[PDB]
Symmetry: D2
């Protein structure tokens, strides 16, 4: 009955179950968790691994000797539990120095500091075995129009990622980068606000094959966009390196609800897509147990993330295996969508009079697409009414 | 006092001033305009040129002989007035045959028909002197998740644009393509919903240099995105081939208000950016005079589009020329944003102890950015209080 | 297996299954349905009744003799099928005369005409047995700020509804009015945009007991509001006279998807609320079969509306009957929410030192609310994983 | 040149200029301000007065003797500067005990504590001369459907406000209450989410004349609603007791930008309305200087709030005084909107054949409303191009 195992590759950020509940209007409602206890608790729930910002693991300002002590304790908990660390990232948003951004801060000395803080953590990530290094530029942006020349900012952003790519290739590291877009919050508008803007930007980097995207369910939904469509475009481009799963109720602040909450039907189509495209990366939950909860609610919320993925996986697999659905997909011509429009080539298309001169536009127009029957079959499967 | 001339390159679609006022809840409130009278009226107002869909100019279903008569009348009005036709496009959305799309319809025969209808109009556009050919895939999309495999749809979309590019290069035509994104309406979700998704898609075409974007103010704002930021990214990529100007009040149906209505401060920053980047393409208005108006209101609304652009152009130029603003831009370190982060290279950055070991993070954090004073100077200029 | 019967009180507007598929960018994809055939087809599917605008039933402009012929044919189909007509409404939005509104048009003669057209249909509605008369002011609004003084418009709106109330009471009719709010579309902003604004307005009418609300799922969601919360407020006020059920994916144009599509979890909480509050009015579907569909898709979409309501009704009833859920509701103190805060009165509260001086704020703060476990039980029930 | 004086009645919350810059992703960027220094600085800028939460003035947990010391220092700064305190409010959102709300917390003992904490501050407010007591129920709400029975919550909310009203009338205090709506943040959905919902709720209180609304520009815009329309409805009801002015760019997190930023044209229509309706309450700024700013930017941002109000006031007054605008208002029949539809009464309307039988619907339909010319005159005035 929907029990996770480490083979399902579910991972969690230390900052998710460790969120103390401080929001812009209220104090923390929970005490801080020791990273070691989070690793142990998540292993008991069936998680595969954890992820971290540098500052989640090593408190800002630590001497190099305290740094080594923090890493050693952490490594011991990984060894004790079998937990992996597939992804790491840099905190370039909490400290006041980053108030105008990290890579695109107007102050050049802050931009250099941001790069040095990142490189330091790339080394640590590689040491712990991370395969993906995520960058969320949460402070790269503006509240007003004149504060940021965006063309210069994009030059500075390209400069920073190119330097990171030069660094990992010169060190011989097997790590790739994933850019995580978000349209706004905490800045009024954030640079590279959606999956598409991030994909387009990567194509202008010096070594584009090193960079992909880490889309988050709730972030694309904060722009009212269709998250499974955006994932499909990322898979089509070959760039889905990692994914952040959670829930979001529409266009408002970033709620980071547990996965399956928010838009349930979008969650169903997302799982259907990830499973049928053979996505094999981590299923990472970037979520925040609501600040109404005590510690038992934190672990129930985390367990719910995994449970909902596994239920949706079962319902999507049943949907695609149902002969009646396979019939309906052909009735709606999904098979014809997958066939080339003009494999016969341009010249044959131009001479083909059934494509224009003799095309019966009124007969083609009358054909129904039968999409509503297909979508009700999908609803019946999601709800277990089939 | 803000009088346009053809040197300002203002253009209008035939379908804008010709919109009869039919909306999803109501009949037309205005009679149809003859394209010839629209060209004459727009020339009197100071417009530079007009744009058209094939079906605006040649009623759907016309015999080749009626086609020639429509083009000849149109060409005579252009000659009589001096009006240009810089852009043309295809209607792949009104006729019922296109109800599931044109290039990405599930039915293969509709996709072939869509391509033939487009190619036919590309020839006409070239004959009339158009330099840009726009594609707005308004029906490419879905209302439900199972109706459209988006990876196959993107294959079909790439297939169609690659064929169009093969066609124009084999004919030797000097015309480029611009993809116009829109996130939704009339489909529940439209493929390539934003500037960024369109930019990313173009990089996967066989001949990317032939394709750019035609962003529309209101369309990016229907996803709550910052339109001047998205334009900056398109300019940075070298892809801003054309632009649709209008107004939109936030996230709702596509209002297509006259330019300057909707988000006035975004209009100001857009004009500032287009003028300071030296955009030299048409300033095209894709707007709809509200259906409350009679024909005198149609021409007042069209005149307002141009008037508002010219007022904003004057206020943006004054803002950038004001020595106090130039001082404030330096106070906020816009100059430093334009300087490379690490022209000294990766190795120098790694050995630079002022970038990390000796960086005074608390001193840098205390520096104010002075953005609010800059933004109030921008407000004062917009309002003519300077 | 989720078969409707007329006892479930499902009703449909003639304009829903009869929508021809004309949207702002495209022609009709389906021929017009005879109202008589819609009544027969809906009776076969298990519907309880139908609703109509005057202009759905009697084509605009009909002579009084054609009017009588249309009503007689309609009445015969009702008799033949047993279908009821519980609600009727007036079309004050399609004809061009209504382009600036009906009750709040700036032109006084249009406002008088709007009232006469309404009164005429109130008589017909009463004759056919309607119990509720709906008013959707779709054209009452503005695209620009100076076009409409809203205080004067609200005076005109109060004037119109007061006259309608004087009319029904002077005729001795047993009919009540329900105002249907919508925030925008087709006007840029519509007056009384949400349930709350409509409830507040009713309290200023001369005879408030005659007026309630007819909320629509998709309309409150076009403002990003929680529809079950808004229904709860309407029930709390005693004003939920009627309801329009459908589906909507977030903040965009009014999609009018079949009920159960859009926000599925909101549909679940809505059904839970209607059923547990004992709402006994019609379950009315105001939806539009997508224009991709032929006539078989129209009836499948209509059947899906009812099927989804009945599935959700079953899952909500199971949720509330589950002893584990009843336990969890007490764990989250839903029982305590239902108990008065201070039945002991103001003076006892002021003298109660356990309410302030001796209140242990830190102990109360540490208590978890256990909401995530409750919400996962609700998810499990919705998905049939319980 | 747009210099404020205390006669303009501009007020500021202590928490606005005192916001330290802590957001959900970052630490404070500014040190705390002493309330005494904020009062002095705001008096120098031309403010009329300040407002406070209990916890802004008296740190949570203070002994009664420290309480008296805080009030005395504060009162001395008011005396020294001439600053007034027209409004006060209660912090029922920051402390963890309020994580599930104050008046509608599920735990009864928290609800009693919330009431006692409020009553204590009502006494203080009266002592300092406040005329309005604001309630913003920021924690009254839910993230999930089963956590909160909204009908019971509204019972608890009515219970709390009725008790407050019994308290002020039994003490003989001349103070009125204003409810401040907000649709979401920090809860997933907040009870009474808009002006309309708050107006409707007040009509069910035992003593409705004691309660009005305190709408905030940005909060109604977070639901995509037209703020000047919502203010007009509040004025029409006689309930606009207070107003929070600021700026907001569309549907996203609550930005609290300085007034005039965000939607500039909505700011213009708001000022036009407040000034022409003779609103005489405080012009209160609930805004947050962005966390990019140092203390000089804080005071520049505060000064900008007042400057923008005064510029907009001048442009709106010029607009309404312009004879050409007065002509255009008559051309668009704003005069006719203000005249009763049917002062002749119901029976005369029914016998008036020019209202229906002989009404020339096609002639009335052809009349243009001339709204676009009016709106361009309004644009010209806003921009100082007239
Ligand atoms: O970069 C990793 C994470 O960092 C921050 O916590 C962001 O809020 C989250 O969206 C992001 O995924
Ligand atoms: O493709 C050209 C135009 O066609 C349609 O009219 C669209 O509504 C508009 O957005 C687009 O720019
Ligand atoms: O007034 C009844 C109906 O009329 C119109 O069709 C509206 O679009 C719908 O929302 C409303 O319910
Ligand atoms: O209640 C007074 C104020 O308290 C809080 O600071 C809210 O964020 C603000 O919206 C409200 O006006
Ligand atoms: Mg997030
Ligand atoms: Mg996130
Ligand atoms: Mg994330
Ligand atoms: Mg548009
Ligand atoms: Mg458009
Ligand atoms: Mg366009
Ligand atoms: Mg609707
Ligand atoms: Mg509707
Ligand atoms: Mg409806
Ligand atoms: Mg706010
Ligand atoms: Mg606020
Ligand atoms: Mg406020």
């Amino acid at each position: 009955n929907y029990q996770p195992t480490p083979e399902d590759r579910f991972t969690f950020g230390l900052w998710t179950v460790g969120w103390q509940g401080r929001d812009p209007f209220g104090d923390a409602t929970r005490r801080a968790l020791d990273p070691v206890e989070s690793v142990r608790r998540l292993a008991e729930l069936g998680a595969h691994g954890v992820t971290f910002h540098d500052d989640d693991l090593i408190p800002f300002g630590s001497s190099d000797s305290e740094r080594e002590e923090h890493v050693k304790r952490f490594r011991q908990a990984l060894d004790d539990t079998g937990m992996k660390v597939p992804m790491a990232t840099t905190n370039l948003f909490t400290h006041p120095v980053f108030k105008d951004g990290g890579f695109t801060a107007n102050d050049r000395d802050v931009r250099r500091y941001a790069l040095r803080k990142t490189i330091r953590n790339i080394d640590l990530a590689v040491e712990l075995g991370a395969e993906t290094y995520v960058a969320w530029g949460g402070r790269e942006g503006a509240e007003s129009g004149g504060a940021k020349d965006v063309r210069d900012a994009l030059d500075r952003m390209k400069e920073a990622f190119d330097l990171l790519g030069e660094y990992v290739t010169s060190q011989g590291y097997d790590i790739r980068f994933a850019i995580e877009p978000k349209p706004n919050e905490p800045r009024g508008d954030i640079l590279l606000p959606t999956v598409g803007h991030a994909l387009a930007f990567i194509e202008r980097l010096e070594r584009p094959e090193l960079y992909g995207v880490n889309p988050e369910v709730g972030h694309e939904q904060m722009a009212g966009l269709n998250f499974p469509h955006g994932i499909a475009q990322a898979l089509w481009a070959g760039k889905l390196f990692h994914i952040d799963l959670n829930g979001q109720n529409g266009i408002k602040y970033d709620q980071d609800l547990r996965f399956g909450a928010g838009d349930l039907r979008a969650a169903f189509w997302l799982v259907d897509l990830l499973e049928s495209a053979g996505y094999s990366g981590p299923r990472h939950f970037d979520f925040k147990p609501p600040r109404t909860e005590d510690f038992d609610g934190v672990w129930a919320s985390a367990a719910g993330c995994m449970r909902n993925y596994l239920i949706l996986k079962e319902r999507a697999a049943a949907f695609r295996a149902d002969p009646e659905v396979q019939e309906a997909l052909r009735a709606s011509r999904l098979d014809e969508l997958a066939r080339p429009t003009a494999a016969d080539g341009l010249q044959a298309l131009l001479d083909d009079r059934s494509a224009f001169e003799e095309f019966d536009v009124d007969a083609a127009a009358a054909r129904g697409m039968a999409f509503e029957r297909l979508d009700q079959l999908a609803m019946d499967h999601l709800l277990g009414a089939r």
